[PDB]
């Protein structure tokens, strides 16, 4: 009894502090060693629990939920290889700056590295892929240890939510017996117990000298904004307003939110991946200033171009000093909040240093290429990869969420998803660009945004098929469009597709999986879209179905390259003739 | 020749970027594998070089120089155990937030973990004791690799200087031949080469909602400032002004600069370590708000007291989110720049919510205890430990630097160094409180502050005796006062001094070293102070000697406890009788 | 009392098991957090204690003691940077396979990574430089925890003594109070307590098929033994006997023991470093089989030669699978005990497959070069570096220990120390070849071997001058010969000595230290040897002095290269003319 009471007081002070620090959800995996942490978080009247038996799927589920809500999400698993399954989501959360509080149970010291069953060295388990690691003490209920448990609870959340955000790992060695005292409840009916650690909201700010320096050096310059994947509060309207004020184009990634923030503007460029391939056009586009926001864009033609830009002022806005610059072209590094920098320029830059011909050159190429793409997709009935993205852009409701898988789906959105006057929250795992856990990440984001849709390739869908168990047992609403080209279509473009001897076994891995059976395994409505009218009917059915939908579109891998190169050629020819 | 030219271009782009990022000094240790980095930094016309053959002493030398100048200092050593000798200074720089750029040469990949001579695994050599680690590529002079070398040069300094500051480690695998091309020079006479990465000055700022919350909750409260070891720009006058505006006492550590910033004030409390021992007095001192600045103070009576303060608002100002709170008593954590918080309250707090009786209670106990200490030291001729500190407080010139060793010297400054109207820059290694490398740290700080003095115990002086070689070969000016009590006097107070069986062998380690010979080994003027007049004459001689001075004062270890407890009792008796 | 009794039972079970596992000595550094471990090891009636206040010197002291006695030696230090000072000795013990049991005290969990005084992250402190790491639990005296403490005590020693031997690290978080119960004694007067874990002696053995394979492929081959630094039991006579049986030369490093095992033989080659420089001679020396023992030899001419040997069978004997092969020339890797392989060939190889002309070619070049060196040193009166080694070879008593420093001293022994019919145990730190801690390592080895001598350069002597404090307080007997060339003489041979602009500041670091004062600081008899007769008289005085002796010989750095190249030329000319 004394042992169980110590175990209860120790974890109650830690769990209550997680809730008071802003944790609302906890994704738990079943286990015997994690029993005291799992039971008490379920007993907590505010913490919402999601139980996932696949630890790999559970990690990405919590990852998507945190990525969509900007909220710190708790993960719990038992000792052993269950904690090793968190590594893909932890590495992705570290490179994408997602606040995951990873709690892993462990054997006590007497059962560590002694060959005990379900025992594993978990000290610094994730290496440098967490912002901080803590090996908690064995449960003690003394005054200093109860305040030590609350201290680490507030510290874990604060370090995870501190810019640059990222995952934190806490290891809990737990000694048997493992059943705490839940009656009476350890969170409620405990008077004179509140001792919350309030954390104040802070943000980084440029000096007055730094502000004057950049305002002076950016006035009257032919500048270009490059906004890659970035998910901060708002920021979509302030970026457009500053670009209108300066007359600068915004090379906007699909994941920047600028292609679908609810309105149309004349500064967002969404065809750069297309026309930056043309050499005869880059002459008139050479800028003097480049100001980067967020991560690096998916566009590889946007890369290379920025890589060869010589004798320019290349600003990079990096609030956390993460130093994400894969081209190493940075000339001026800025470590301040993006919202602050946008406002501080909005009311300091001159209101009339706008070379109209500069923005006219970018918007001309962009709007001409934009309509050639929309023309080729409107006049086709073959449901090619680009057509799937085009019809999604047309059929998605306002205030809808769209999770985009890596590989071809994210690159096809960059090519075939122009700016539209609807609010579409777009997410993707762009830390390591892994095809793993995409289904769970979308399901976690479906807790926040509704209606939620997922554009994903076939290989990636198989990878995290287990995620769908969360959709089945929690009655979740998600519409999954599978671009089943039966293998890896990303490898038809890369130069390995010309050697046919070992292709289709090392790269284009054919699966021949009938996803209709997988849709039945997870209680999902299945539709095979063979025509444009069928794909429509399926999407319209998915809105009237509050549940899991799967819309498979079989495409041809060996025809993608020709379709994309035919479109890119028609764009280059038209833009070459422009004066 | 092509190999040597590649080696020259690669390192020149890296070294020039370190200089342009603010590096002015480089402490180098001799070695064959570090040849190309050592020769090129010496060839650089701006980088100043200090050569130290003891790598342990070299690390602490650079540590003191960075700690005194707020400048990022480069360390260079060769492959092998030479890099292992950096670990004490690196661990101290990490816990004390000092920007050290640790560069360690290494064997190329073909000579790594193959039993090669002077080869050692140096990947993540310092573990979590560096903010970042980089294993540089083998030298390449391609366009991308030359920009990669400059990129890491600017990144290393920026990450090290970014709050919370700390050391960074870069490993350089270097392949033979190792002699670069210095004629013509690779830094000058190289046109169209400037591509510096300018970093802008940023700082953290509280939100408007956070400012309003704290101003409201601190108005009219019986608050107390606790300023431990902190070395930021200025901050000494703003703290006193805010405390005068609010009527709050400042429990000021010696290393906070508030005991010697050039003026006298009526809010700094420098006797708390004395009177917080008395139980009958703490009744009238119980506060409602505690606002902490800097690290944790050396005073252990200031600890315990703050540890048992219940039902208070315990603010902790932590610009880097380092979470330094060994008592875990934090109620409100603040992650903003200290200067910003001081100003934002200076002009938001009410100018008239001052309970005069509150500050009167603290200053009464402080000024009475302050004069009892000064009376006991003025009326004594025995050169006890407290008397040495007292006479230093009287004889030090204005705008002088005083490095204080750990163990008893730092605690005797806290007891016997009241606030004085002189500007005395006080430093100490308070990250891990190691008695190692204190001499080198003082010598590094002597490059910045002059005249420089060092109060150090005998065991600590022996520990880093090799540091004095830097003073001999570089004609450095430092006056070292050795409190030779022949062992560890810190262990006479702790409860291990009552068992005499194994004492004097495990704790009070007698050395019987005649430091007169050590002073001759390093070309230093030696003085043995036996009386107060002799200690004076020696200090006055040290100012007229531009060089190294060593003033030894032999004290009795077994009489320290009685002297300190007699003084503390006379203070407690007087303050008990106060109404 | 209950807390102190738990602390006593916990550590007593651990310390007693270290003693029963073969630990006889413990090198302790003073500290407050290490109080319970330090007091109890002193209380133990079998464990011998050495107290060293320099943790860096303490590590190398224990390193030398373990390297000389083949016994596992315990290190103890307090929490903080004191444990960081162990890193050079730990890295050297890992690369040289020395069984060090590194015990570091630590703060309890509530004081870990919270900014506590003298606190430092010590989890995996030494990274990959230890064979194993253990973070011990807080003291508990339950039945399972007392057996857990004994378990780790037996496991630490066993893992450290297991081939390949190496250091192990155990971290002890200790909570106050820290004073255990020593009266009554916790080791004696404790009936029904013996539960020792006996470890049986095991060794690796080749299969019958592996034995038949190598005996067949080595019969009648022109083979060569290469024995680098190796310190196993005996092995000196078995190697010579097998080489006599096969007719194979033994290219023997000075640290192989084959140049001074008590007798003269006709198979040990000690001039290879000299004559392998000559190109016209290597023609007749090309072998078919190379069998390597121990580490890689210091000779760089022995390197390169073995590196370009093509189409040979290069065997490497590696009992621990450490894979020490810096030339990567291995063709047949053998993971068995050296003694077993020597015997198994001694009685399986044919007794008559000896090409007399093969061994005659090696011994001819060796004996001619050997006498040219001895002639040049016998006919000179200038006390050059080679002459110092020559006179040491003549004046050292039988059954004497000689510690050799790195840099030039070890290379001068390889050149000027021919095989002699005296038993001279030669040691050196050849893991990383660091010039640090050489004095302490020699002093630790002086506990085992007597009389002990140390040949060391001036820079290396200064590096670990603090080691001499152990000689002063423990009345140790060691005769130190300092080859003071006032800087780094190793850099006059390397190709950096032709650029005089930055030489003598980066490589030849002149110190101008009068080591006579350092000898007085440590109560040592000092002699300056200016002639050959003076160096003799000093050595003869050192045998009649039971204590610390220091014999300084000032040499010229800028004349070493010419002296060595003149000798090497006279050898090459004579050996070129040989038929
Ligand atoms: C976890 C993971 N495994 C492997 C890869 C390598 N990879 C990149 S794209 C790709 C093909 C994925 O195919 P699919 O999801 O069907 O996309 P599409 O066919 O539309 O290109 C693979 C295996 C990866 N990025 N992440
Ligand atoms: C590197 C290091 N080793 C050991 C310790 C443990 N320690 C703390 S205080 C102390 C005594 C130092 O003695 P000294 O410098 O002479 O001071 P005083 O006698 O004035 O107390 C020791 C060994 C430490 N803090 N750092
Ligand atoms: C700890 C360490 N620091 C630096 C080096 C680089 N190093 C190799 S040899 C040498 C010179 C040492 O000089 P000394 O001991 O006087 O030898 P000698 O002059 O006889 O060559 C140095 C600094 C090293 N091997 N180990
Ligand atoms: Mg696919
Ligand atoms: Mg002392
Ligand atoms: Mg020398």
| Residue of chain A minimizing CA distance to C173 | A137
Tokens in use for B370?
Answer: 């302050």
Q: Give the residues surrounding ligand 3 with Cβ less than 6 Å away.
A: B 30-31, 55, 78, 80-82, 118; C 405-409, 433-436, 457-460, 483, 485, 488-490
Tokens in use for A453?
Answer: 């849709």
A120 annotated as a binding-site residue: no
Of C446, C447, C433, C440, the closest CA to residue C464 belongs to C440
Interface membership of C530 toward A (CB under 8 Å): no
Task: Please tell me the distance from the alpha carbon of residue A490 to that of residue A485, in angstroms, as a whole number.
Answer: 10
Please tell me which of the candidates C110, C135, C145 has its beta carbon nearest to residue A144.
C110
- Cis check for the bond before A529: say yes or no (omega within 30 of 0): no
- Give yes or no for a contact between B255 and B229, defined as CB atoms under 8 angstroms apart: yes
Ligand 2, atom nearest to B456 Cα: 15
Cα of C181 to ligand 5 centre, how many Å?
A: 28
Partner chains of C (3+ C-beta pairs under 8 Å): A, B
DSSP string, A464-476: TGGGHHHHHHTT-
Which ligand neighbours the alpha carbon of C490 most closely?
3
How many inter-chain contacts (A to C, CB under 8 Å) are there? 32
CB of A440 closer than 6 angstroms to any ligand 1 atom: no
Resolution at which this structure was determined, Å:
2.6
CB of A437 closer than 6 angstroms to any ligand 1 atom: no
Of A300, A416, A431, A435, the one to substitute when testing ligand 1's pocket (max ligand atoms within 8 A of C-beta) is: A435
Of B389, B404, B406, the one to substitute when testing ligand 2's pocket (max ligand atoms within 8 A of C-beta) is: B406
What angle is formed at CA C236 by the lines to CA C233 and CA C241, rounded to 5 degrees?
Answer: 130
Strands B202-206 and A202-206: antiparallel
Tokens in use for B195?
Answer: 């591509």
Chain centroid, CA C414 distance in Å: 16
**A562 Cβ contact partners less than 8 Å away, ≥ 6 residues apart:** none
Burial of B320: CB neighbours in 10 Å, binned 0-12, 13-18, 19+: middle
Task: Please tell me the distance from the alpha carbon of residue C558 to that of residue C243, in angstroms, as a whole number.
Answer: 41
Kindly determine whether residue C110 and residue A138, on different chains, have CB atoms separated by under 8 Å.
no
Collapse the DSSP code of C334 into the 3-class scheme (helix H, G, I; strand E, B; otherwise coil) and give the result: strand
Half-sphere exposure of C125 (CA within 13 A, CB side): 32
The C-alpha of B88 sits at a distance from chain A's nearest C-alpha, in angstroms, of 22
Kindly determine whether residue C113 and residue A134, on different chains, have CB atoms separated by under 8 Å.
yes
Kindly determine whether residue B331 and residue A195, on different chains, have CB atoms separated by under 8 Å.
yes
Cα of C393 to ligand 2 centre, how many Å?
A: 43
CB of A457 closer than 6 angstroms to any ligand 1 atom: yes
Tokens in use for C17?
Answer: 């098991």
What angle is formed at CA B155 by the lines to CA B153 and CA B160, rounded to 5 degrees?
Answer: 105
Neighbours of B285 (CB within 10 A): 18
Which ligand neighbours the alpha carbon of B408 most closely?
2
Collapse the DSSP code of A11 into the 3-class scheme (helix H, G, I; strand E, B; otherwise coil) and give the result: helix
- Residue of B124, B196, B197 best to disrupt the A interface, most CBs of A under 10 A: B197
How many inter-chain contacts (A to B, CB under 8 Å) are there? 116
Of B508, B456, B459, the closest CA to residue B482 belongs to B456
Interface membership of B197 toward A (CB under 8 Å): yes
CB of A336 closer than 6 angstroms to any ligand 1 atom: no
Collapse the DSSP code of C375 into the 3-class scheme (helix H, G, I; strand E, B; otherwise coil) and give the result: helix
Kindly determine whether residue A158 and residue B195, on different chains, have CB atoms separated by under 8 Å.
no
Kindly determine whether residue A201 and residue B214, on different chains, have CB atoms separated by under 8 Å.
no
Chain B residues in contact with C488 by the CB 8 A cut-off are 30
Chain centroid, CA C320 distance in Å: 17
Interface membership of C138 toward A (CB under 8 Å): yes
Partner chains of A (3+ C-beta pairs under 8 Å): B, C
Of B38, B36, B32, the closest CA to residue B10 belongs to B36
Tokens in use for A512?
Answer: 């021949």
- Give yes or no for a contact between C539 and C551, defined as CB atoms under 8 angstroms apart: yes
What angle is formed at CA B333 by the lines to CA B331 and CA B337, rounded to 5 degrees?
Answer: 150
Kindly determine whether residue B295 and residue C121, on different chains, have CB atoms separated by under 8 Å.
no
Kindly determine whether residue B330 and residue A200, on different chains, have CB atoms separated by under 8 Å.
no
Of A459, A482, A486, A493, the one to substitute when testing ligand 1's pocket (max ligand atoms within 8 A of C-beta) is: A459
**B540 Cβ contact partners less than 8 Å away, ≥ 6 residues apart:** B395
Question: In Å, what is the CA distance from C286 to each residue of A522, C95, C223?
Answer: 73, 31, 9
Cα of C393 to ligand 3 centre, how many Å?
A: 23
Task: Please tell me the distance from the alpha carbon of residue C522 to that of residue B462, in angstroms, as a whole number.
Answer: 12
- Give yes or no for a contact between C48 and C25, defined as CB atoms under 8 angstroms apart: yes
Neighbours of C313 (CB within 10 A): 16
Strand (E) or helix (H) holding C478: strand C478-484
Interface membership of B324 toward C (CB under 8 Å): yes
Residue list, CB under 5 A from ion ligand 4: A 457-458, 485, 489
Kindly determine whether residue A321 and residue B210, on different chains, have CB atoms separated by under 8 Å.
no
Of A294, A296, A299, the closest CA to residue A269 belongs to A299
Chain A residues in contact with C158 by the CB 8 A cut-off are none
Task: Please tell me the distance from the alpha carbon of residue C513 to that of residue B166, in angstroms, as a whole number.
Answer: 35
Tokens 């520990």 — which residue? B463
| End-to-end Cα, chain C, rounded Å | 85
The C-alpha of B566 sits at a distance from chain A's nearest C-alpha, in angstroms, of 33
Chain C residues in contact with B28 by the CB 8 A cut-off are 506
Interface membership of A203 toward B (CB under 8 Å): yes
Collapse the DSSP code of A577 into the 3-class scheme (helix H, G, I; strand E, B; otherwise coil) and give the result: helix
Please tell me which of the candidates C109, C145, C148 has its beta carbon nearest to residue A137.
C109
- Give yes or no for a contact between B140 and B8, defined as CB atoms under 8 angstroms apart: no
Question: In Å, what is the CA distance from A546 to each residue of A225, A469, A516, A539?
Answer: 40, 16, 19, 12
Task: Please tell me the distance from the alpha carbon of residue C268 to that of residue C227, in angstroms, as a whole number.
Answer: 10
Interface membership of C141 toward A (CB under 8 Å): no
Of B40, B52, B46, B48, the closest CA to residue B466 belongs to B52
Task: Please tell me the distance from the alpha carbon of residue B570 to that of residue B575, in angstroms, as a whole number.
Answer: 9
CB of A386 closer than 6 angstroms to any ligand 1 atom: no
The C-alpha of A44 sits at a distance from chain C's nearest C-alpha, in angstroms, of 26
- Give yes or no for a contact between B76 and B27, defined as CB atoms under 8 angstroms apart: yes
Task: Please tell me the distance from the alpha carbon of residue A379 to that of residue A566, in angstroms, as a whole number.
Answer: 15
Question: In Å, what is the CA distance from C429 to each residue of A61, B118, C64, C418?
Answer: 54, 10, 9, 21
- Give yes or no for a contact between B430 and B444, defined as CB atoms under 8 angstroms apart: no
Burial of A503: CB neighbours in 10 Å, binned 0-12, 13-18, 19+: middle
Kindly determine whether residue B144 and residue A321, on different chains, have CB atoms separated by under 8 Å.
no
Kindly determine whether residue A109 and residue C136, on different chains, have CB atoms separated by under 8 Å.
yes
Please tell me which of the candidates C55, C80, C436 has its beta carbon nearest to residue B432.
C80
Task: Please tell me the distance from the alpha carbon of residue A29 to that of residue C73, in angstroms, as a whole number.
Answer: 46
| Residue of chain B minimizing CA distance to A324 | B155
Collapse the DSSP code of B558 into the 3-class scheme (helix H, G, I; strand E, B; otherwise coil) and give the result: helix
Strands B100-106 and B168-173: parallel
């Amino acid at each position: 009894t004394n042992h169980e009471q110590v175990l209860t007081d120790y974890l109650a002070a830690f769990i209550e502090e997680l809730v008071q620090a802003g944790v609302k959800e906890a994704i738990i995996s079943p286990g015997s060693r994690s029993t005291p942490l799992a039971l008490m978080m379920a007993e907590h009247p505010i913490l919402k629990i999601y139980v996932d038996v696949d630890e790999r799927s559970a990690g990405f589920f919590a990852l998507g939920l945190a990525k969509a809500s900007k909220r710190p999400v708790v993960l719990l698993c038992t000792s052993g290889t269950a904690a090793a399954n968190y590594f893909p989501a932890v590495a992705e959360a570290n490179l994408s700056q997602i606040p995951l509080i990873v709690l892993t149970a462990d054997r006590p010291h007497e059962l560590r590295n002694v060959g005990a069953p379900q025992a594993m060295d978990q000290l610094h388990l994730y290496g440098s892929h967490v912002k901080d690691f803590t090996d908690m003490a064995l449960p003690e209920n003394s005054e200093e240890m109860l305040r030590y448990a609350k201290w680490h609870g507030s510290r874990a959340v604060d370090i995870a939510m501190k810019t640059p955000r990222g995952p934190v790992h806490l290891n809990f060695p737990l000694r048997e017996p493992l059943v705490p005292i839940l009656e009476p409840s350890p969170f409620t009916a405990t008077g004179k117990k509140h001792h919350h650690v309030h954390i104040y909201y802070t943000h980084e700010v440029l000096d007055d000298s730094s502000i004057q320096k950049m305002v002076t050096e950016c006035t009257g310059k032919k500048g270009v904004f490059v906004v890659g994947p970035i998910d901060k509060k708002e920021l979509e309207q302030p970026m457009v307003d500053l670009a209108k004020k300066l007359g600068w184009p915004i090379l906007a990634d699909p994941l920047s939110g600028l292609r679908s923030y609810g309105a149309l503007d004349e500064v967002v460029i969404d065809q750069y991946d297309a026309f930056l391939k043309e050499a005869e056009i880059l002459d008139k586009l050479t800028p003097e200033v480049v100001i980067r926001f967020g991560s690096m864009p998916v566009s590889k033609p946007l890369k290379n171009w920025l890589e060869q830009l010589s004798d320019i002022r290349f600003y990079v806005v990096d609030p956390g000093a993460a130093w994400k610059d894969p081209i190493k072209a940075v000339t001026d590094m800025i470590h301040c909040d993006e919202r602050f920098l946008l406002d501080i320029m909005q009311q300091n830059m001159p209101d009339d240093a706008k070379d109209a011909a500069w923005l006219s050159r970018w918007t001309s190429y962009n709007k001409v290429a934009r309509e050639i793409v929309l023309a080729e997709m409107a006049n086709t009935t073959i449901l090619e990869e680009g057509k799937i993205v085009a019809e999604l852009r047309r059929l998605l409701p306002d205030k809808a969420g769209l999770f985009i898988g890596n590989s071809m789906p994210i690159r096809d959105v960059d090519t075939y998803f122009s700016q539209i006057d609807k609010k579409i929250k777009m997410l993707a795992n762009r830390g390591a660009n892994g095809i793993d856990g995409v289904v769970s990440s979308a399901l976690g984001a479906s807790v926040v945004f509704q209606p939620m849709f997922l554009l994903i390739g076939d290989l990636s869908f198989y990878h995290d098929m287990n995620g769908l168990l969360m959709a089945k047992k929690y009655k979740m609403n998600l519409t999954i469009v599978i671009v089943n080209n039966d293998g890896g279509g990303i490898f038809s473009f890369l130069p390995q597709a010309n050697e046919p001897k070992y292709f289709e076994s090392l790269f284009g891995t054919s699966t021949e999986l009938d996803f209709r059976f997988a849709a039945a395994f997870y209680d999902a409505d299945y539709h095979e879209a063979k025509s444009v009218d069928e794909l429509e009917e399926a999407i319209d059915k998915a809105s009237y179905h509050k549940g899991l939908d799967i819309i498979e579109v079989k495409t041809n891998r060996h025809e993608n390259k020709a379709n994309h190169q035919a479109l890119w050629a028609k764009i280059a020819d038209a833009l070459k003739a422009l004066n």
